[PDB]
Assembly symmetry: none
Homo-oligomer: 131 residues x 4
């Protein structure tokens, strides 16, 4: 049977979801999101994997870089390298190359991802046996 739950979205993502509802001919948020979920629905251990986090963050946010460096230092992952460029005057893009287990990597991602001024932290993992 049919059940109704609540989702919370940041404005920028909501606006885009609303535009996609219109461009693609959906009738509601509920309907498109349902179709997305249904489509998605179609892991974690102690092994060391190499990973990459791609982080876009707000340039004007004070102390953000410091907070990221501290987290990287505090992490139980081994961060090999961080590289930063400016995309525009509002945004910087960073790649973090790191080694750790699935739990350590996921924690880093969510920690960085939840900081104010971080637009996203997207993860790429490669396990030994897939290279």
């Amino acid at each position: 049977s049919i059940i109704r739950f609540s989702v919370s979205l940041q404005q920028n993502l909501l606006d885009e979801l609303d535009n996609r509802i219109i461009k693609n001919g959906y009738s509601s948020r509920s309907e498109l999101v349902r179709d997305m979920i249904r489509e998605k629905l179609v892991n974690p251990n102690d092994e060391s994997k190499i990973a990459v986090l791609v982080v876009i963050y707000d340039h004007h946010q004070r102390e953000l870089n410091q907070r990221m460096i501290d987290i990287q230092h505090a992490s139980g992952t081994h961060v090999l390298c961080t590289t930063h460029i400016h995309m525009d005057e509002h945004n910087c893009l960073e790649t973090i190359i790191l080694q750790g287990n699935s739990f350590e990597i996921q924690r880093l991602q969510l920690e960085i991802g939840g900081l104010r001024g971080v637009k996203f932290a997207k993860l790429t993992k490669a396990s030994s046996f897939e290279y």
Copy 2:
């Protein structure tokens, strides 16, 4: 502004959905957020135009002509490489993160072409859309 809205779903699917919240570090609201972002970015990349992405490649530097080949592909693709970081992982494996600017076709093509080369063991693209950061 985080905005609350409700979604309606069949219990059998809400149970499958809810089976993955903690597995993936998160509330239900957080896992669906990530699903939505992913699909909206895919959709954006499928349509209409200067995009940012990161290509992650793991490759064997012993393949004689591979790096120059990757460079030639990228030059002919029309994409701009903003920056590249390379880690010499071990005797064979190099990992690179290549920060790319261009049209979504050009960028996705560069990925496909590079992933097909002998010596390339891994090639995965991270896409970004301007609605995520403007």
Copy 3:
């Protein structure tokens, strides 16, 4: 075109010069080449104008406000940061290579200012001049 020319020198100084050829990996011609390049770059940086350099900094990330401080200094300097790479060396020490574009004053000032901060253990600039690469 490598061009041969001769130089004249007092033996006591040619002996000191020649004492350092092998010590530094090189013929006499190679060690003097490097000396000349260095002085010519210094001279170029002293005069008259968009320059490229790399700043290398080793610093303690436990100094509370240091990274933001470095960022504020750099923003107020007028220099453009093209790219930054950071290595988390150990519990305290971070090494960064900061690729800079700007006037030689601005860039040299940024170095001096950063080298004076508590927590900064090392700050050394690599200068380039357009005669080296145009």
Copy 4:
């Protein structure tokens, strides 16, 4: 007493030396170079040091990146990280962050520095006790 030896310079460096002779009021190559040497003249061991090579190289030179990667891989130094950007359409700039002893580091520098298409390879070293 006074002795006469030969130096060989790449054209771009010779041209610049000639311009400096004129701008600063020197009378000869021999005289300015002598004054440079005299000014300069006013080390290597097995300890691990952290170092950085800053390399500017010709973008159009084919197989150069490959040759650099191979050298970095073959080196007895531990190369932590390489980062590359384009300066212009003719030049790229790379930083190599590495650990090794003085002999290993110097060899890497000269190996990379002697490749066709490399405009320079400039070294920065920091020993443990100087940080």
